[PDB]
Amino acid sequence: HKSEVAHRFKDLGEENFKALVLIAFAQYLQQCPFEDHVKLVNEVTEFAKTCVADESAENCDKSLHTLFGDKLCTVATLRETYGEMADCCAKQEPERNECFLQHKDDNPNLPRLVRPEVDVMCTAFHDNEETFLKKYLYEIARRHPYFYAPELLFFAKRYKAAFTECCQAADKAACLLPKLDELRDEGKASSAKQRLKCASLQKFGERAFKAWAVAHLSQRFPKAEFAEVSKLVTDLTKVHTECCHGDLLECADDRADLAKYICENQDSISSKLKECCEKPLLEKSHCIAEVENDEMPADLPSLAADFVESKDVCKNYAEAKDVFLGMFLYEYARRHPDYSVVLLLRLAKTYETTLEKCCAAADPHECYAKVFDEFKPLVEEPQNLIKQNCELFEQLGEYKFQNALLVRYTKKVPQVSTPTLVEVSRNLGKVGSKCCKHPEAKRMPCAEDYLSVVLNQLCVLHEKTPVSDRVTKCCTESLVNRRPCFSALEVDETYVPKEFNAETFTFHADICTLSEKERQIKKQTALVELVKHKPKATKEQLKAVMDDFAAFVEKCCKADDKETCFAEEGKKLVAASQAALG
Alpha carbons 229 and 225: distance in angstroms, whole number: 6
Residues 169-198 that bind ligand T44 (CB under 6 A): 185-186, 188-189, 192
The type of residue at 358 is C
Q: Is 142 in the site for ligand MYR (CB under 6 A)?
A: no
Task: Tell me: does residue 431 bind ligand T44 (CB under 6 A).
Answer: yes
Told to check if 340 binds ligand T44 by CB under 6 A, we report no
Which entry of ligand MYR, ligand T44, none binds 203, CB below 5 to 8 A by partner kind?
Answer: none
Cα gap 261→146, rounded to integer Å: 26
Q: Is 292 annotated as ligand-binding?
A: no
Q: Interaction with ligand MYR in 428-467: which residues (CB under 6 A)?
A: 428, 431-432, 444, 447-448, 451, 458
**Which residues contact residue 306 at a Cβ distance below 8 angstroms, ignoring those fewer than 6 apart?**
313, 331
* Integer Cα distance of 325 and 317 in angstroms: 8
Query: With binding defined as CB under 6 A, does residue 125 bind ligand MYR?
Result: no
Q: What contacts 65, CB < 8 A, 6 or more positions away?
A: 93, 94, 97, 249
- Helix-helix angle 14-26:149-166, to 10 degrees: 110
- 448 interacts with ligand T44 by CB under 6 A: no
**DSSP3 helix / strand / coil % (the chain, rounded to 5):** 70, 0, 30
Contact partner, 281, from ligand T44, ligand MYR, none, Cβ < 5-8 Å per class:
ligand MYR
577 is a site residue for ligand MYR (CB under 6 A): yes
- Encode 34-52: b = buried (16+ Cβ within 10 Å), e = exposed: eeebbebbeebbebbebbb
Q: Is 529 annotated as a binding residue?
A: no
The CB-nearest residue to ligand MYR is 487
Site string for ligand MYR, 528-567 (x = CB under 6 A): --x--x-----------xx--xx-----------------
Q: By CB under 6 A, which span of 145-153, 254-262, 356-364, 426-434 interacts with ligand T44?
A: 426-434
Q: Which residue is nearest to ligand T44 (CB)?
A: 189
| Cα–Cα distances in angstroms (integers) from residue 147 to residues 27, 71, 280, 577, in the given order | 9, 22, 21, 50
Q: CB–CB of 418/521 below 8 Å?
A: no
Each residue 376-405 as x (binds ligand MYR by CB under 6 A) or -, in order, gives: ------x--xx--x-------------x--
Q: Which residues of 357-372 are buried (b: 16+ CB within 10 A; e: fewer)?
A: ebeeeeebeebbeebe
Determine if residue 548 is labeled as part of a ligand binding site: no
Q: Does 423 bind ligand T44 (CB under 6 A)?
A: yes
Give the Cα separation of 166 and 179 in Å (integer): 9
Residue 63 or residue 457: which is nearer to ligand T44 going by CB?
Answer: 457
Residue 11 among known ligand-binding residues: yes
The verdict on 143 binding ligand MYR (CB under 6 A) reads no
* Neighbouring residues of 305: CB distance < 8 A, sequence distance ≥ 6: none
Q: Using CB distances below 5 to 8 A depending on partner kind, what does residue 185 bind out of ligand T44, ligand MYR, none? A: ligand T44
Number of neighbouring beta carbons within 10 Å of residue 578: 14
154 binds ligand T44 (CB under 6 A): no
Interaction pattern, residues 296-325, with ligand MYR; x per rule: CB under 6 A: --------------------------x--x
Number of alpha helices (DSSP H) and beta strands (DSSP E) in the chain:
28, 0
Residues forming the site for ligand T44 (CB under 6 A): 185-186, 188-189, 192, 423, 427, 430-431, 449-450, 453-454
Numbered residues of the known binding site: 1, 4, 11, 65, 238, 242, 245, 247, 250, 253, 257
Which residues contribute to the annotated binding site for Cu cation? 1
Annotated binding site for Zn(2+): 65, 245, 247
